[PDB]
Amino acid sequence: QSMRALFITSPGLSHILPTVPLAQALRALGHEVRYATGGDIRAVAEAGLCAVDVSPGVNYAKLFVPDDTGEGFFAEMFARVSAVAVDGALRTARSWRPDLVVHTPTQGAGPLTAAALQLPCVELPLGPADSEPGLGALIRRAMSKDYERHGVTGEPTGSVRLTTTPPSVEALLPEDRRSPGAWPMRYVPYNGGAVLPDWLPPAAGRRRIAVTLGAKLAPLFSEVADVDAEFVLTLGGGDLALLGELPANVRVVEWIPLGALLETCDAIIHHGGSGTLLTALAAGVPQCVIPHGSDTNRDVLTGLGIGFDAEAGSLGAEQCRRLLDDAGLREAALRVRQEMSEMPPPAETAAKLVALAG
Amino acid sequence: QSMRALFITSPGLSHILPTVPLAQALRALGHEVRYATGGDIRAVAEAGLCAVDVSPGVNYAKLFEGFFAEMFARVSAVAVDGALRTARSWRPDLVVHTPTQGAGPLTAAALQLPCVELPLGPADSEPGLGALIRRAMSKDYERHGVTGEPTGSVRLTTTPPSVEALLPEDRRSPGAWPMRYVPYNGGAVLPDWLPPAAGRRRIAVTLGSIDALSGGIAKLAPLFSEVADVDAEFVLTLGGGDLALLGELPANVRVVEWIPLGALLETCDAIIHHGGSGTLLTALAAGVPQCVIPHDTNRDVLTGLGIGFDAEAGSLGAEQCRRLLDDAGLREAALRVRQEMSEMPPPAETAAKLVALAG
């Protein structure tokens, strides 16, 4: 009576991580889970899960950009990237016999595999960034050769879309970038496990601001000496760092699960990554994004009034105090948090999927 | 709205692993989980969970009824300070502990929290053990001014009723909440050879984690001298043991350093093992006939339930292997216990109950 869920993800760490809670939910229900990916596959292993390398010793760097150095171009790209997974995905699917395929939006091997075995596919995006529906359709198109090679002429049984995006945030998305009929699922931050450091528990009545860029950068810390709060700057992983003199309130740390960190923080400064955004939203903590160029994530902050933009140069004490003191930001943040907590948790969503898969 | 579960485990890998599914279940339900332990703490990290090292400095080797109690109390003692520290700051609503880890009920009593006891199997239950260990840690309880009792004390069991029925009365555990045994042996990138070959049967051979060490492997030498004649693939998980200690082995014997057992057993038709609890339960869950090598109760379970047998390290050959593969009686009984286990509530269900308990 145990159902089987095959997780076919993009090779990127950031596409894998937000699938983990659901994978763990299914195990917790007594079902079985297996991943079929490449690249950042260790992450699966390191999440107490099992995975098959669909593309052993393949250089993904080259696939995303091969030459010397709109929609149609990126599709073409994702198709190339997905293409190298198709064979393995099918292999493991055929032997392991899943009842259900779970995929990430850009990972074309997923729906392919689903269609081949006449299984339902469950689409799990990393957030509201990759919520473009025509995306999967276009990628399917571009992988025509692969579909044909394996003699996949059918469509998947049923196709469910999940979203971990709360309604208020959803409401502030462009019309074609939103996703009605999608099953809501609570965003449970997963950033990896860890042995937590001693300094983590916060000091008495001492505020804390998390900073995470994910190389020289002294102009921010310069200004931040004036602000009455602890600053925890996180490095990002296998990252080495040379410390000159930093203000006494600035603490530099290698890598720490964000969720764990943000539980102790009163605000966050970051690059604007989806995982970080949602984790911060979940934490109910005002946000400042340091952008670059001229994306959605940033526009959400403004829209919801949970935060703001700040140019890398334009990053001083003024912004930091706004984060800490502007009651408006805090309130709005806690409001989205509450809203997120009202979304069904992965356990609940898992149970629904089981029922879906017969 | 989100509940907080503090997991205070024994330092031993084998005590940590069987707590993980429940820990993951709680996260799956949207709650929060944190471990407070020492020693084999990496395992918690490597399970996508977070942990605080309660005893950073400590050498556990040198730390290891009344006698064993005394021992566990000494071991647990070095965790008390950290456990309390992390508990006090993190503010759990619920303490989850393993039976031998006295820092657990201590912490629970200190904060006036309910404690939830999670054994590694039936060979770890031993009701009344905690009472002795509590006694022995009197000094610690007093030091931290813990005079109370825990709010409520739940016992979980992952042991199926049939197996339970075949246990001595005082080694039974009534009132314990059943929870399905979900094998957890660690994550992995699974090797290419794992999917089984065309109509080729497979037998798993294994000695556990802390048993194939110090020349444990050697005991498999006569077994391997005869398996060549048997119509089956043999997968041996050395897992620390010495390969040379067997030297030349037949072509139908495949060796690996480590593979998650559950993943393996899914592809196997039977198993040969040391008789370890985790291995036993994993095998049971797999619904696969079992052969144990004695080096206690468990070994009597196999016989009782008719899911397997004892083969003395010596008389261990093609004979036993074919019994495992062909004796319809073993297969059927194994699948029967598997079914029975699958009817036990899964950790998701148990986790939800615990939340409500910690209201």
Ligand SMILES: O=c1ccn([C@H]2C[C@H](O)[C@@H](COP(=O)(O)OP(=O)(O)O)O2)c(=O)[nH]1
């Ligand atoms: O290749 C391996 C080797 C070991 N294990 C794990 C599975 C099992 O859960 C544990 C052994 O269980 P145990 O008998 O309780 O461990 P011990 O007797 O070492 O305490 O080791 C694996 O999953 N794969």
